[PDB]
């Protein structure tokens, strides 16, 4: 009860656990909203560039980009998802006999 | 019946004409019907686009720099071209393209629209003496030899290449004797057994260039200037060619735009200070964001501030009030289809229960233009009876311990 | 161009006395990272404590 | 996207791309949700004692509930640090300075269990173990 | 002292002023400090030439 963080290295898993979660959807998400094209605000050539055209280009690549990013992060949620799945049966298993 | 481009599901019968078809942009459920491309959906909760916050109140944040100069006096050559740079200065683009007709406008890598109506970080012109015949010749990349060894307008930066020639009723202008270019330029190396052609840079000044004489006294003139030992010795090489002075005179302008200076507005109450709602825009930089007096973190030697993101936050840029601000706020929706029981219940995640507006009262953002107070779940649901506990219970689990059975009729 | 005010009338240039060795010392002053010594604060705008 | 006219005509080219994000994450959703009940299955159908300040003699209990969120559970989500998670109030907090909602753009889910209705789970386990001994 | 192109790590005070920066170009162990991107690392194996 006294000592979580330095004697008890499980309590250290918890927290490293916890922050991976967190860091993993924090990072992820606001790094693909950072301006992903080469030269734009999130938007590709708003109003600046040739008008139409060129807004349309830019636009594209960023979106066919962010759409390859995002399909990264769910596979990352499936694979977490799956290993849940597995640690928890075995934490089931635990609670039906050690406990 | 007006009509409009529009994604529909369309399900046929055994004829194969249509009889039903199902419209996605109205109605949430519509949406959900599109998704699992299914008439019925099986009942589960499915998160709707968030509604964001309608833009009001936009506030806009934007010396009288003349272009006489450029088209005063005689224009020098393509090679002894000179450049103007215009900062921090009110400018027409209507007075310039009336005072000399122009034979061709192009821009590359911006709009000629969008330069003008925006407001540049700084504005160089380059004033030179072009015939009107050889306009391929001119280009912002060529392998031609007036890119190669006169003039050349850097690629990288959004650059405009104009061709004009200038009126006869204008006198500010001088006719140069004949138009003049270098058609080769080279250096001779020490040795001699090899000899290096240079290639000017876009705004880059030419050794060859100052050697020859403003005006080339003859077509293909050779002029020879021995290198001193400390440059490395060998001898410079330039031939000229003479183009015959055009009865009107022509002139070549490259016109260059500059973002890349932080703090500078060649620009050509409701934009003024007060304004604590979501549009905003300021000097270079516009962004939607709510401003309140913070006065916690910046030097403020640069009006915009950066948050360690690619965009930047761009608060405390009037120096006189330090106001900071938040990101636009948006509500997610999430409808329960609850097929078995055919009823639909929205609820919106957070944001409190009285912040939400109904009908989208302050979002912009809404499935179409026709959308579909009580205690506080989650978020505000549209439902008579706000606890019926052990009444025909269903496992919806829309929120987080409430049920929602409805066989509406939440939190049992 | 511009005017720098009338140009010096004096008729020589005062001599000058040239002591390299004399001006040589051990004075070493070498680049602090950790103290920020010579580094130029991005121009474009002000950042985060981050 | 922020949300454009142009950036609409390539998303609805796109559209399937984008359902097919949206399914996946349904899917994760929900297993997750059928694991947390299995394990709570296990838990559920078991007797248990009365919650008792002093189960036995001469023994320390920091497990007995100060009452919900036993004191050591307490502990243990006090020194870690999570702010990535705010309902009903979460945007609010957002705006009085973690801000899913405010930029990007998604929605971090609710557990669907209460922390009071962990505490009642571990609360019969804690019945159960002396029983069961 | 000639200045040529390279990455620091910044430090901003609440002043936003740089009172420290880290090279890290330098040497092996400013480059695990810029690879984390942290000023403070703890000690660890690094990559190195």
Avoid at chain 4, 65 to 94: H, N, W
């Amino acid at each position: 009860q006294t000592g979580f963080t330095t004697t008890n290295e499980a309590f250290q898993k918890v927290q490293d656990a916890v922050n991976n979660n967190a860091q993993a959807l924090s990072k992820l998400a606001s790094e693909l909203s950072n301006t992903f094209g080469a030269i734009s605000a999130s938007i590709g050539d708003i109003i600046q560039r040739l008008d139409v055209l060129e807004q349309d280009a830019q636009i594209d690549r960023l979106i066919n980009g962010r759409l390859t990013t995002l399909n990264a992060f769910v596979a990352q949620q499936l694979v977490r998802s799956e290993s849940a799945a597995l640690s928890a049966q075995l934490a089931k298993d635990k609670v039906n006999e050690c406990v | 019946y007006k009509l409009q481009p529009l994604t529909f599901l369309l399900d046929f019968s055994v004829d194969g004409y249509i009889r039903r078809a199902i419209d996605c942009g109205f109605n949430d459920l519509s949406q959900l019907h599109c998704s699992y491309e299914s008439f019925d959906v099986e009942s589960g909760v499915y998160s709707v686009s968030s509604f964001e916050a309608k833009p009001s109140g936009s506030v806009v944040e934007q010396v009288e720099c003349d272009f006489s100069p450029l088209l005063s006096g005689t224009p020098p050559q393509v090679y002894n071209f000179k450049r103007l740079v215009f900062t921090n200065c009110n400018y027409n683009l209507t007075k310039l393209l009336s005072l000399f007709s122009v034979n061709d406008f192009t821009c590359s890598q911006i709009s000629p629209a969008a330069i003008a109506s925006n407001c540049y970080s700084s504005l160089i012109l380059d004033y030179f003496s072009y015939p009107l015949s050889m306009k391929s010749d001119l280009s912002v990349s060529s392998a031609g030899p007036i890119s190669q060894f006169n003039y050349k307008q850097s690629f990288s930066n959004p650059t405009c290449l104009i061709l004009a020639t200038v009126p006869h009723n204008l006198t500010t202008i001088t006719k140069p004797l004949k138009y003049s270019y270098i058609n080769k330029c080279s250096r001779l190396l020490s040795d001699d057994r090899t000899e290096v052609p240079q290639l000017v840079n876009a705004n880059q000044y030419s050794p060859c260039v100052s050697i020859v004489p403003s005006t080339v006294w003859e077509d293909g003139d050779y002029y020879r200037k021995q290198l001193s030992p400390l440059e490395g010795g060998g001898w410079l090489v330039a031939s000229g060619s003479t183009v015959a002075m055009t009865e009107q005179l022509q002139m070549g302008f490259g016109i260059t735009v500059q973002y890349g200076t932080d703090t500078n507005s060649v620009c050509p109450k409701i934009a003024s200070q007060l304004g604590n709602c979501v549009e905003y825009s300021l000097y270079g930089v516009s962004g939607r964001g709510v401003f309140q007096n913070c006065t916690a973190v910046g030097v403020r030697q640069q009006r915009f501030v950066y948050d360690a993101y690619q965009n930047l936050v761009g608060y405390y840029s009037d120096d006189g009030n330090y106001y900071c601000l938040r990101a636009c706020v948006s509500v997610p929706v999430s409808v329960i289809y609850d097929k078995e029981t055919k009823t639909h219940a929205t609820l919106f995640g957070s944001v409190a229960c009285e912040h939400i507006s109904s009908t989208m009262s302050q979002y912009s953002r809404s499935t179409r233009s026709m959308l579909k107070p009580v205690g506080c779940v989650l978020g505000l649901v549209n439902s008579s009876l706000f606890v019926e506990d052990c009444k025909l219970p269903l496992g919806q689990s829309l929120c987080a311990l409430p049920d929602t059975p409805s066989t509406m009729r939440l939190a049992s | 161009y511009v005017d720098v005010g009338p140009d010096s009338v004096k008729s020589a240039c005062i001599e000058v006395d040239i002591q390299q060795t004399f001006f040589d010392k051990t004075w070493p002053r070498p680049i602090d990272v950790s103290k920020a010594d010579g580094i130029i604060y991005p121009q474009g705008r002000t950042y985060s404590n981050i | 996207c922020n949300g454009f006219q142009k950036c609409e005509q390539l998303l609805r080219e796109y559209g399937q791309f984008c359902s097919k994000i949206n399914q996946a994450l349904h899917g994760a959703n929900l297993r997750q949700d059928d694991s947390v009940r299995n394990l709570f299955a296990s838990v559920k159908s078991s007797q248990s004692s009365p919650i008792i300040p002093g189960f036995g003699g001469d023994f320390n209990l920091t497990l007995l509930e100060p009452v919900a969120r036993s004191a050591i559970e307490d502990l243990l989500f006090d020194k870690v640090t999570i702010a990535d998670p705010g309902y009903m109030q979460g945007y609010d907090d957002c705006m009085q300075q973690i801000c899913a909602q405010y930029v990007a753009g998604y929605k971090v889910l609710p557990p669907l269990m209460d922390v009071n209705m962990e505490a009642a789970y571990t609360s019969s386990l804690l019945g159960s173990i002396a029983g069961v001994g």
